[PDB]
From a paper:
StnA is an essential enzyme in the Streptonigrin biosynthesis pathway. The crystal structure shows that StnA has an α-helical cap domain positioned atop a common α/β hydrolase domain. The data clearly shows that Ser185-Asp308-His349 constitutes the catalytic triad of StnA.
Residue numbers in the entry: 61 to 380
The structure:
Amino acid sequence: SAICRATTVEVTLGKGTGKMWGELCRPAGSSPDTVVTMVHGATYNHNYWDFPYQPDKYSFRKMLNGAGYATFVVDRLGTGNSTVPPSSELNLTVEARQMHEVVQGLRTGRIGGTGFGKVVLAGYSLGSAVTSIEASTFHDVDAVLITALGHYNNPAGTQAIIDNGLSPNDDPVLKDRHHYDDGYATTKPGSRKHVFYADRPMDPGVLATDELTKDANVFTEAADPLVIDPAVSRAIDVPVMFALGDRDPLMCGDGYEDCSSQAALRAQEAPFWTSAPSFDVILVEDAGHGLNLVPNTRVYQDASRDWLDRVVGHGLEHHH
């Protein structure tokens, strides 16, 4: 049971700045040299990476602390407790530069006081695109965790989200937070089960908690050619882990992302990660888009932890 402090970070936004909310946690009675920064995907916020239902099972953040890593989870601008600007001011490039400012903040100690020797950047859905752009542009991270985002997507899956899209102003969870402009969307109540989790077995408590902790996105970001541009990923020169669910409705399918086997998936993605000194791949069985939220999520947590231990470590070991 971990020691945590929330803050806001001033971050570049258009001509001026905006506020990004984040939470820094350390394991209790320790001070790690590695911090893992986690970037959520579209229609999520920080809750995805620190899930408040059965956290000993579903909280990735908590698992990391328990493994001796420091963690920093953020609400992206437009979401959560962060600034909600006009949507025209937000795009992936802008958001990547904001993450770059968070990474620097963590390295220098401006965020969290201690300063961190190693910084791992972890992403999910379009969070992974932000993560990739950041690492590709600024080269100031020691490793990169890419989840739920491949270079081929399933257009029918994409289109299915759009069919279940709606303004946060007509959504019961988000109605009363802000008057959102026309560039914001979220998902229809009850739809996430299908369009994200592919109706695969999940705890009802998880589905409900996910629906209650959902959020808005700036939807034009999904159409940004940078999401799948090979120039972004091929330029990344630190260790990469790539994780994907074998029932992921947004990626997987005949002629799209190859979820037939872990090896086949690696073979298909490898050409896109040519500067990476290592490229690890995990294909999670019976899992849709949300890897943190599935019943067999521990397999994925364990593989991620093992990878971190192998490739950066946490700064508390005595090992060789």
